[PDB]
Amino acid sequence: RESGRKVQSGNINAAKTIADIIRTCLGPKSMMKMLLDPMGGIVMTNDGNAILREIQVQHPAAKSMIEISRTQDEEVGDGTTSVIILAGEMLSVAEHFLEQQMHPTVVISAYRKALDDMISTLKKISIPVDISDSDMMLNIINSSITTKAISRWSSLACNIALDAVKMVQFEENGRKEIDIKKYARVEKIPGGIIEDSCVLRGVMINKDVTHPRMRRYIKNPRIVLLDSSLEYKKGESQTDIEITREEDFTRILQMEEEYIQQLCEDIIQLKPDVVITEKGISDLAQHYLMRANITAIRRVRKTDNNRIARACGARIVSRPEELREDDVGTGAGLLEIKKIGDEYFTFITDCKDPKACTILLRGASKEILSEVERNLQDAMQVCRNVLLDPQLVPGGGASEMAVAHALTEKSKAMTGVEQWPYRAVAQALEVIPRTLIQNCGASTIRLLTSLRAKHTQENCETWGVNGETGTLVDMKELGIWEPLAVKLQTYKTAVETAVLLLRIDDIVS
Amino acid sequence: EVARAQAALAVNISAARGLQDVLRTNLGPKGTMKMLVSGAGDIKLTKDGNVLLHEMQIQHPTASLIAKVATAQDDITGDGTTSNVLIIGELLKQADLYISEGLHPRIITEGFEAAKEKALQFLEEVKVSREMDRETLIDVARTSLRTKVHAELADVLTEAVVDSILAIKKQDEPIDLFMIEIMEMKHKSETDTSLIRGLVLDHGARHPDMKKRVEDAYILTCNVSLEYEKTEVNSGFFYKSAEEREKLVKAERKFIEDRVKKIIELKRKVCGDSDKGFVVINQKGIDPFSLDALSKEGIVALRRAKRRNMERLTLACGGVALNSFDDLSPDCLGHAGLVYEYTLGEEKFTFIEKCNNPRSVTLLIKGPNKHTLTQIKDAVRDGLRAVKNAIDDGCVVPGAGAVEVAMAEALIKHKPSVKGRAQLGVQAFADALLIIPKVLAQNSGFDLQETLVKIQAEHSESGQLVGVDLNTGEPMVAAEVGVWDNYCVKKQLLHSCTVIATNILLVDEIMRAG
Amino acid sequence: TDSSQGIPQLVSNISACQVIAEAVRTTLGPRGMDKLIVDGRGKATISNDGATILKLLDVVHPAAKTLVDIAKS
Amino acid sequence: MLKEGAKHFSGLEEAVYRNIQACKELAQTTRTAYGPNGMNKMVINHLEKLFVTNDAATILRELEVQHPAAKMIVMASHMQEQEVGDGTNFVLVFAGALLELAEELLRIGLSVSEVIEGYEIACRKAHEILPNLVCCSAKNLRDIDEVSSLLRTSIMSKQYGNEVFLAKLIAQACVSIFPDSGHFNVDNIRVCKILGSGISSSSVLHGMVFKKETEGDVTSVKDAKIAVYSCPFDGMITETKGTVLIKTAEELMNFSKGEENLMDAQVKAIADTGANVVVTGGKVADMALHYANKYNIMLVRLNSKWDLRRLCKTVGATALPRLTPPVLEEMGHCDSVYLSEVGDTQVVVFKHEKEDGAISTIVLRGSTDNLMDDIERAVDDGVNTFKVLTRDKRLVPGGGATEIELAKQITSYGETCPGLEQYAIKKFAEAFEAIPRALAENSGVKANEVISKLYAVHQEGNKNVGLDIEAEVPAVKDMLEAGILDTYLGKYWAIKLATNAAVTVLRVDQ
C-alpha cells in the first residue's frame, strides 16, 4: 500500500531502476546486463525481455511496467526496452514537480499531446517504405537483424522472413491489416542442408506427427483431421449400456463399428490414405484405420490439425456426420512424409485459404537452424510491422530530437502548464541520444546540444545520432530504420504506461 | 540485490587474477602441479588452465563463466588454457585502468578489434610453417607436456604421443579420435608410458590365462552368451511360482553349452590348432566351465572387454563382431600378431596387438593408477591434442612467449589503425598479450621489463622469434628450442579471450535473478 | 584420532597413575580413611586392598590403565 | 583466491606454509624412531590393546589431516613399507627435515621450480654413488648372521633391546625356506601369537600354527582335505531349561535327534567330503565332536579369521557355514597336520615344507599382543626387509652409517654445481643428520655433536650413533662393521621415495 509521492517517487523507483542498465542494454552498441541467478548463475542480457522475468519485483508499478514490456513483447518483441524506458523516463521529471503544481491530470492530457506531436512529427520523418521491393524492406529488415546480430542467417532468413510474412500476407479482415504471422512458423529439422531454410505454403507438421506408417508419402490421398470421434459410438450417434447379459453384447457392437463405419463410410469417400485423429483416436479406432488401408495417426493433437487446418487449409471436422475433402485435406492435397534427419516430417503443402504458409528452416543442426530461426524473428516481426505499416522512419536522435524540440516548440506553442510535461517528455526523447552515446563512450552533452543544433538547422529530420557510429547523422543516409510501425507502436505503449502509473497516486490492497 | 557500474565491474577484474595466480604457478614447465583435495571433494592433482577450473566446485559467479571458454580451447589445444586465462584478466587490468582513468567499455572494446585483427593478422604475419615431423612433433608434444609436466616425463609422454600420431596419420586422420587410447596400468611406477600396437584387453577370463599368449589371433569379439546365466530365474527373474524357476535354468546353461560346443566346432573350424589362436571375447561375462571347456583346448575366451573394445577389437584387429559362434572361419575374424594376457598389478591385461589394420594403437601408461598416473594421463591427452593440432596445422609458431614480442611489441609499436580510438583498446590488447612471456619470466625471479626488453628488442634487433626459458625466466630463442605454439592452439585463445572479455566488460550491473 | 605429544602428555600420564596410589598410600596396613564408594550403578564399592577399587576404576588413559593392569598383573 | 568461491586446502601461503609444516610435524615419530630407540608411541585405535609403536605405517594409519601433502605423503611412506620394512621410520623424518630446508630457502625466496630439483639432482647424486657406498651383502639366507645382521638394523630401527634374539629367531625361522629366488611369502611364514611363555620362548614352528585348540582327534592323514568352515557346527537344534530347573523331561530328546543325526550326516559328510581335518570358524557341538572323532576328522573347536584367512590363502580354503552335508572346495594344501603343543599350548598345526607354498611359521609367545605385535612389527619389518628378492641384500653400512658417507659426498657435490641448486644439494647434504639426530635424540645428544665428530671421521662408513651411551658422548657406534647392517634396497627407496613425496608437495597450490 502506497500513496502520493510514495507511489509517484516509487513509480520512479519502479521503471527507471528497470530502465537504468537497459539503455546501456539498448541501442546498436547495446551493453548487456550481468545477472546473478538464484543458483549463483549469470545471464548476460541486452534484453529488456529477460531482465524483468528474472529480476524480482522492486515496486508494484514495476509489475505494471513488466506487463507493458510484455505488451510490447506481445505486440512486437522489441521495444520492450524503450516502453519501460520511455514511460519510466517520463516518470522522473514531470510528476512530483507537477504534483507540486498539483496534478497527475494536466500531465496526462500533456502526455496525450506529448504523444500526438510525435505522431504529428512522424508522418514526415516516418515516410512510406515500399513493401513491394524486398530490399526496400530488407534495409529495414537488415536494420532488424543488425543489432541482435546472428550475422550468417541475418542474411538469408531475412529474405526468408521477408517472404515469410509476405507469403503469409493475404490477410483479409476487409481492412487489409497485416498482423499476420502465425501462418509463418519455423520448422525444427534435424540434419539436412544449412540452406533450404525457406518459406513453404501451409504447415509442414514438425510437432507431433511422425510415423513409420503414413506410408512414406501420401500425396493425392487426403490428410484427414478428426476432432470427431473416430472411436465407436454404441448407439446411433450415441452410446448405450455395457454387457451384463448374453442379450446385450451382440446389440452393442453393431452400432459401435457401424458408427466407425458410418463415419468411415463418409470418411473414406473423401480418399485419405492418412487420417490424422487428434480426438477419437484410440486402439480400435486407429486399428480400424490400420484395417481401413488408411494410416492410423496417433500422438497427434489440435495444434497439429489446426496447423494442418493451416497446412492444406482443412477444417478439422466438427461433424460426426458427412466428412468430405474440403473438411480435411483441402484441395488435391499434399501430405509429404520426409525424413530430413531421422524425424518423419509431415509436409502438408497446397494450402487452401492460401497465403497461410509456414517456413521450412533447415540447418545442418538445430543451432545453425535456430540461427535461422532467431534471425527470422526480428525480420519477420518487422516485416509483419512493415507489411502492417508500410512506412519507415530514421532512427536514433532523428525521431528523438525532431519530436524533442517539437514538444518543446509545442510547449512554447502552449507556454502553459502542460508545457512542463512537454518539457519533460521532449527530454525523454533525448535520453536515447544519450543512450546511444552513453554506449559509444563520447560525451553526449557536446552532441546533445549539437543534436539540438542538428535540430537548430535541420530539425533533426533524418539526422539522429547513430549508436554504433556515435555521431549525429542522417538515417536515410545510413538506412537505419525504425518504422512508424515499430516506434509509434513502442512509443504508443509507454505513452499510456507513464499515464497508467501516474494514474496511480495510491497503491492499496 | 544489485551492484552498480564499477561495483559489478570490480567483481569482474577481481576474480580474474586468482585464476591467473594459479596459472602464474600453473603455466609451462615453470608452473607447478596442483593437488586439489578440496575442489570436487576428490583427492586430485592437475596442471592446466582449463582442468583446474572444472575440478573445483566454484561458487563465484565471475568464475562460473570462466571454466566455460577454456573448455572448447583445451578440446582443440591442451595448452593456452594455462595461458588465455592470463591474458583475459591482464586485459581486465588494462580495461579497468582505462575506465579507472574513465571510459566506456564500448570505446574500450572498439580498439580491441583492429588490435585483435593485427595480432590475429600477425598470426598470419608470423605463422611458422613447420614440416610436421616426429622430431618437430616431439617438440610440439613435449612443449605441452613440459607445460604440464617434467620435461623428463614430457619426453616420457612424448614418445607414446609421437608414437600414435604417426599411427593415427596411418589412419589418414589429421585430428586424432583413435590411438588416443591411454591405458592405465597397475604398477609400482607411473614412469612407464608405453605403446601397444593394438588394444589392452580387460579380462582374459574369470578362469584366467586360458590361452594367455596368442601370437596369431583369430578374434571373435562377441556380445554372445557363454554366460547366459547359471543361476535361478523363471522368466528371467523371480516369479511367484518357485517350482517354475529352475525349469528354464538348465536350458540357460545349455544355451551356453550350445555356444560352447559351437566353439569346439568353431575353434576346430577356425583353428584346428592352439598355434594360431581363436579368441572369444565376450561383452558379457563367460562361464568358467565355458572357459574350462575352451581353455583346455588352447582357446582364450575373454569376457567383458567393453564396447570400446568391441569396436577397437572389431576395428584395430581387422576384427569382427559376430553374435553367433556357430561355425566361422579365421578370416571371418580379424587378426593380431600378438594377443597376450598380461598381469602387472592385480588384473591380467590381455594385449591384443600387432593388430592388422590397427584402428586403435593403445598408449600404455603403467603406474599406481592414482591422480599421479592421471596427472600423466591428462598431459599426454592434452599433448596429444597439441600434436593433434600440430598434425592439423602445417604451421606452428614458437612457444615460450616468443610470439608476443613479435606480436604485442608490433602492436606496442603501432596502433594497428594508428589512431587513438584503437589505442583505447590497443593499449589494453597489446599489453595483455605480454603476460605469458613476462609472467614465468618474472616467476623465475627475473623482472619482466628487463626480461621483456631483451626478448622484445631481441625480436626487434634480429627479427627473431625469441623465446623465454620458462624455468630460468631468460630470453631464449623458441624457434629452435621446440617450445612451439600451434597455429590452431594460439588462434582460439585469442578469440576465447576476446569472446569472453567483451560482454563481461560490457556488463556494468549484476542483480540477483531469483 | 587424538594425541598429545612431548612432555605435556608424558607428565600428564603420571598423576592419573599416581592419584590411585595416593589412595593405596597405605591400604595394606589399612589405617587411613575409607570412603564407601557408590558408583553410577548404585553399587557401594570398597576393598581390603587397592586392587578391587582399582578393578572398579577405569580410565581412557593407557598410562593410568597400564599400572592398573600391572598392579593387577 | 580473489573469489568468495572455488576451493582449496592448499596454496599461496599454505603451500609454502601448511603443506611443509605438518608434513614435517608428522616426523615426530620418525624423529624419535628408526634406529635404536626406547621412545615409543602409545597409539590407541581402540582395540582394548593399547598399542606401543614406533612404526610409521601403523602410526600414520590412524593419522588423518587436511594437508593434501600430509594427506597424500603417507602414501609414499606406506608405499615404502610395501617395498622395505625397515627404512620406513627413516622415510618420514628425513624428507620432513629436508622439507623446511627448502622453506627456509623460500623465506630466502628460492623457488619451488628451483629448490626441490637440487634435492632431486642430489637424489640422483645419492643414488648415483649410493650403490658405491654399499659394502657388504646378505648372501647365504639359511645362515643366521647374514640374515640376522640385516635384521639387526631393521628390528633395531623399530626397537632396540629385543632385536638380537628376534634377528636370530627370524634367521632361525629360515625365511630362506622360501629360497628367496624371487620367492617370499608373508602368510606361509606367519606370526602366531601365544599368550605367555617367553618372547625368548617365542619360536618358529614350521607349518601353519593355530593357537586355536585342536579338538578331539588329529588328522586321519597328513595330506588332509582340510575342512575350513565358518560355521560347520553351530549346533543344530539346542537343548533348553524352562522352569529354572528343567523344562520337560519329555521334550529333551527330539532336539538331540535333530542335532545328532544331522551332525551325523553333517560330519559323516564331513567324512564324505573327505575332510581329514575339519576347521571350525565357529564353535563345535559335542555331538559333532563325537562325530568328528568317529568319522576320523581332526576338529578345530574355534577359528579366528587369522586361521580362516590363511586357510583360504594357503589351503585354497573357503570358510563355510554348514548345517548341511558339506563338500570340500577347500581340499588341502597341507602335507602335514597336527595337534602340537607350541607355546606349550595345544595348537592346531597344519604343516608341509617346500620351497614354494611352504608354510614355516613363526610362533610368538608373549603375555599380550602389544608384546607380540609391536615386537612382531619390529620383527616383521626385518622380515619385510629380508624380502628383497635380490638374494644379496647389498648391505650398506647399517644403523645409517652411510649418512656421514653420503653427507660429505653431497656437500662436496653441492660445492661443485653452481646456482641455487648447489644450496638445495647442500641442503640435501643436510637432512642426513635426522636419524643420527633421531638416534642422538632418543640417545640424548644433538646430531651436531654427533655429526661434527662424524664430520671429523670424514670418510668412515662404520661409526654412526643409535640408542646407547656410545651414541651420546662418543658420537660413535660402529654400524658398518657391526652385526648391524642394512640393505641397499631401502637405501634406493627412502632417499628417492621421501623425495618423490617432497617433489610436488610444494608445487601443489590448490
Write the DSSP string, D267-291. HHHHHHTTEEEEEESS---HHHHHH
Which region, left, alpha or beta, applies to residue B468 given φ > 0 means left and ψ of -120 to 50 means alpha?
beta
D chain contacts of residue C1, beta-carbon cutoff 8 Å: 62-64
Q: Is B169 exposed, middle or buried, given 0-12, 13-18 or 19+ CB atoms closer than 10 A?
A: middle
Active site residues per annotation of B: 48, 81-82, 382
Amino acid in position B492: Q
Contacts of A94 (CB under 8 A, 6+ apart): A107, A110, A420, A421, A424, A425
**Cell numbers standing for residue A320:** 460426426
Q: Which of D2, D79, D113 sits opposite B17 (nearest CB)?
A: D2
Residue ranges of alpha helices (H) inside D108-143 are 115-129
**Residue type at B435?**
I
B-contacting chains (≥3 CB pairs under 8 Å): A, D
Q: Please tell me which of the candidates B59, B106, B509 has its beta carbon nearest to residue A33.
A: B509
Contacts of C12 in chain D (CB under 8 A): none
Put simply, the answer to whether A34 touches B65 (Cβ < 8 Å) is: no
Nearest chain B Cα distance for residue A363, angstroms: 22
D420: enclosing H helix or E strand: helix D420-428
Contact A75, A497 (CB under 8 A): no
Q: Do D510 and B56 touch (CB under 8 A)?
A: yes
Instruction: State how beta strands A272-277 and A222-226 pair.
Output: parallel
Block residue for cell numbers 530490399? A135
| CA end-to-end distance (rounded Å), chain A | 6
How far is D82 from chain C, CA to nearest CA, in Å? Answer: 24
CB count in 10 Å sphere of residue A474: 18
Q: Is D63 in contact with C65 (Cβ distance < 8 A)?
A: no
Q: What is d(CA D219, CA D331) in angstroms, rounded to the nearest whole number?
A: 13
Q: How far, in Å, CA of A494 to CA of A497, rounded? A: 5
| Whole-number Å distance between alpha carbons of A131 and B280 | 72
One-letter-per-residue 3-state SS of A404-459: HHHHHHHHHHHCCCCHHHHHHHHHHHHHHHHHHHHHHCCCHHHHHHHHHHHHHHHC
Beta carbons of C5 and D50 less than 8 Å apart: no
**Shortest Cα–Cα distance, C2 to chain D (Å):** 8
Question: What is the least distance, in Å, from the CA of D18 to any CA of chain C?
Answer: 19
For residues D19 and D9, give the distance between their C-alpha atoms in angstroms, rounded to a whole number.
9
Nearest to A327 by CA among A223, A202, A200, A218: A223
| Strand-strand pairing, B362-367 and B182-186 | parallel
Under 8 Å CB-to-CB from B1, ≥6 apart: which residues?
B511, B512
Asked if the Cβ–Cβ distance from B511 to A440 is below 8 Å, we say: no
Asked if D375 contacts D469 with a C-beta cutoff of 8 angstroms, the reply is no
The Cα D152–Cα D159 span in angstroms is: 10
Number of residues that this document lists for chain D: 510
Residues 50-89 of B with CB under 8 A from A: 59, 61-62, 64-65
Pairwise CA distance, residues A468 & A28, whole Å: 6
Task: Judge residue D395's burial from the number of C-beta atoms within 10 Å of its C-beta, 0-12 exposed, 13-18 middle, 19 or more buried.
Answer: buried
Q: According to the annotation, is D17 in a ligand binding site?
A: no
Q: Return the SS3 of B351.
A: strand
Return the C-alpha cell found at D356: 614354494
* CB-based contact A310:A202 (threshold 8 Å): yes
Give the residue among B367, B340, B428, B481 at the shortest CA–CA distance from B119. Answer: B428
Q: Which of B61, B108, B507 sits opposite A40 (nearest CB)?
A: B61
Say if D71 is an interface residue toward chain B (CB within 8 Å): yes
Task: Count Cβ atoms below 10 Å from residue D154 Cβ, excluding itself.
Answer: 36
Alpha carbon of A30 to those of B99, B105, B450, B467: distances in Å? 18, 11, 41, 41
CB contact under 8 A, D28 and C5: yes
- Which sign does the torsion angle of CA B9, B14, B19, B24 carry? positive
Give the distance from residue D63's alpha carbon to the nearest chain C alpha carbon, in angstroms.
Answer: 7
CB contact under 8 A, D6 and B62: no
Q: Do A36 and B106 touch (CB under 8 A)?
A: no
Q: Which residues of B touch A41 (CB under 8 A)?
A: 61, 64, 513
Strands in D330-428 per DSSP E: 336-342, 345-351, 360-366, 396-397
Cα–Cα nearest to D337, from D322, D351, D318, D353 = D351
Sign of the Cα pseudo-torsion (B71, B75, B76, B81, in order):
positive
Alpha carbons D456 and A449: distance in angstroms, whole number: 93
User: Chain C: residue nearest D45 by CA?
Assistant: C1
Residue B460 · residue B409 · CB < 8 Å: yes
Torsion-angle region of A27 (φ positive above 0: left; ψ -120 to 50: alpha; else: beta) = left
Question: Using the beta-carbon criterion (under 8 Å), do D50 and C65 form an inter-chain contact?
Answer: yes
Is residue A222 within 8 Å of residue A270, measured between CB atoms? yes
Q: Is D233 annotated as a binding residue?
A: no
- CB contacts under 8 A, D 79-118 vs B, are 79, 83, 109, 111-114
> What CA–CA distance (Å, rounded) separates B219 from B317?
7
The β-bridge partners of A393 are A482
**CA distances for A370 relative to A154, A156, A158, A197, A356, angstroms:** 12, 13, 14, 10, 22
Q: From edge to edge, which strands make up the β-sheet containing B277-282?
A: B300-303, B277-282, B217-222, B320-321
Neighbours of B454 (CB within 10 A): 18
Q: Which of D271, D262, D264 is nearest to D237 (CA)?
A: D262
Rounded Cα gap, residues B68 and A44, in angstroms: 14
D332 in a known ligand binding site = no
Q: Cα separations (Å) of B91 from A439, B321, B410, B501, D354?
A: 20, 54, 17, 8, 74
Chain A residues contacting B via beta carbons under 8 Å = 20-21, 24, 29, 31-44, 54-56, 438-442
Chains B and C touch (3+ CB pairs under 8 A): no
Interface-testing mutation among B500, B502, B507, with chain A (most A C-beta atoms within 10 A): B507
Find cell 670424514 and name the residue.
Answer: D458
Using DSSP, how many helices (H) and how many strands (E) does chain A show? 17, 14
Size of the C and D interface in Cβ pairs below 8 Å = 12
**DSSP track, D66-110:** S-HHHHHHHHHHHHHHHH-STTHHHHHHHHHHHHHHHHHHHHTT-
> Cell 627435515 belongs to which residue?
D97
List residues in chain B that are followed by a break over 2.5 Å (C to N). none
Instruction: Put the strands of the sheet holding B182-186 in their side by side order.
Output: B182-186, B362-367, B193-196
Neighbours of chain C (3+ CB pairs under 8 A): D
CA distance to partner chain C, nearest, from residue D459 (Å): 35
| Helix (H) or strand (E) run with residue B303 in it | strand B300-303
**Per 3-state DSSP, what percentage of chain A is helix, strand, and coil (rounded to 5)?**
50, 10, 40
CA distance D452 to D469: 17
What residue type is B351 in one-letter code?
F
Integer Cα distance of D221 and D332 in angstroms: 11
- Would the annotation count D399 as a binding residue? yes
Distance from CA of B122 to the nearest CA of A (A): 25
- D175 vs D189: CA distance, rounded Å: 7
In chain B, % helix, strand, coil (3-state, to 5) comes to: 50, 15, 35
Radius of gyration over every alpha carbon of chain D, rounded to an integer in angstroms: 28
- CB of A418 within 8 A of CB of A507? no
Q: How far is CA B428 from the centre of its chain?
A: 32
Task: Let me know: does A489 contact A76? Beta carbons within 8 Å.
Answer: yes
**CB–CB of D311/D317 below 8 Å?**
yes
- List of E strands, D120-207: 193-195, 203-206
Going by C-alpha positions, the residue among A272, A188, A179, A265 that lies closest to residue A222 is A272
Residue A80 known to be catalytic: yes
Non-local CB neighbours of C18 within 8 Å, separated by 6+ positions:
none
- In this complex, do B107 and A440 lie within 8 Å of one another by their Cβ atoms? yes
**Strand-pair partners of D485:** D397
Determine how β-strand A506-507 pairs with β-strand B2-3.
unpaired
Compare all CA atoms of chain A with the CA of B62 and give the residue at the minimum distance: A42
CA distance A82 to A490: 7
Which 8-state DSSP code applies to residue D176? G
Q: Contact D7/B35, CB-based, under 8 Å?
A: no
Binding site feature residues of A: 27, 78-82, 147-148, 396, 467-468, 482, 487
Phi, psi of A95 (to 5 degrees): -55, -65
Query: Nearest 5°: phi and psi at B491?
Result: -70, -50
Of A472, A435, A454, residue with least CA distance to A88: A435
List residues forming the annotated binding site of B: 28, 79-83, 147-148, 400-401, 485, 490
- SS3 for B32-99 is CCECCCCCCCCCCCECCHHHHHHHCCCCCHHHHCHHHHHHHHHHHCCCCHHHHHHHHHHHHHHHHHHH
Q: Å resolution of this model? A: 8.7
Q: Taking a C-beta distance cutoff of 8 angstroms, is the pair A60, A43 a contact? A: no
Q: What is the SS3 assignment for A74?
A: helix
Nearest C-alpha neighbor of B280 from the set B268, B269, B266: B266
Interchain contact D28–C (C-beta under 8 A): yes
Q: Does C9 touch chain D if contact means CB atoms closer than 8 Å?
A: no
Q: Which long-range contacts (CB under 8 A, 24 or more apart) does A130-135 make?
A: A130/A390, A131/A166, A131/A386, A131/A387, A131/A390, A134/A159, A134/A162, A134/A163
Are the beta carbons of C1 and D50 separated by less than 8 Å? no
What amino acid is encoded at B497 in this protein?
Answer: C
Cα distance from N-terminal residue to C-terminal residue, chain B: 10
Q: What is the DSSP string of B365-382?
A: EEE--SHHHHHHHHHHHH
CA pair distance D353, A267, nearest whole angstrom: 94
What's the gap in Å between the CA of D487 and the closest CA on chain B? Answer: 20
CA D267 to CA D286: how far, in whole Å?
12
Task: Determine the residue type at A326.
Answer: D
Are the beta carbons of C67 and C42 closer than 8 angstroms? no
Q: Widest CA span of chain C, in angstroms?
A: 43
Q: Does B251 reach chain A within 8 Å, measured CB to CB?
A: no
Q: Quickly count: other Cβ atoms within 10 Å of residue B486's Cβ.
A: 30
Find the catalytic residue in A45, A71, A81, A358: A81
User: Given D2, D9, D510, which is nearest B14 (Cβ)?
Assistant: D2
Cross-chain residue pair B107–A41, CB shorter than 8 Å: no
A239, A342 Cβ separation under 8 angstroms: no
Q: Using CA atoms in the order A290, A293, A295, A298, what is the torsion angle rounded to 10 degrees?
A: -30
- Helix or strand or coil: residue B65? coil
**Is B25 an 8 Å CB contact of chain D?**
yes
Closest residue on chain B to D108 (Cα): B445
Classify residue A134 by burial, with Cβ atoms within 10 Å: 0-12, 13-18, 19+.
Answer: middle
D219/D276 Cα distance (integer angstroms)? 5
Find the helix or strand (DSSP H, E) in which A473 lies: strand A471-474
Distance CA D472, CA B22 (A): 48
CA-based nearest residue to A484, from A400, A407, A386: A386
| B460 and chain D in contact, CB less than 8 A | no
Any idea which residue has 616468443 for its cell? B402
Pairwise CA distance, residues D229 & A389, whole Å: 94
Q: What is the DSSP letter of A34?
A: P
Q: How many whole angstroms separate alpha carbon C51 and alpha carbon D165?
A: 35
C-alpha grid cell for residue A220? Answer: 493425392
Q: Which residue in chain D is spatially nearest to B446 when comparing CA positions?
A: D111
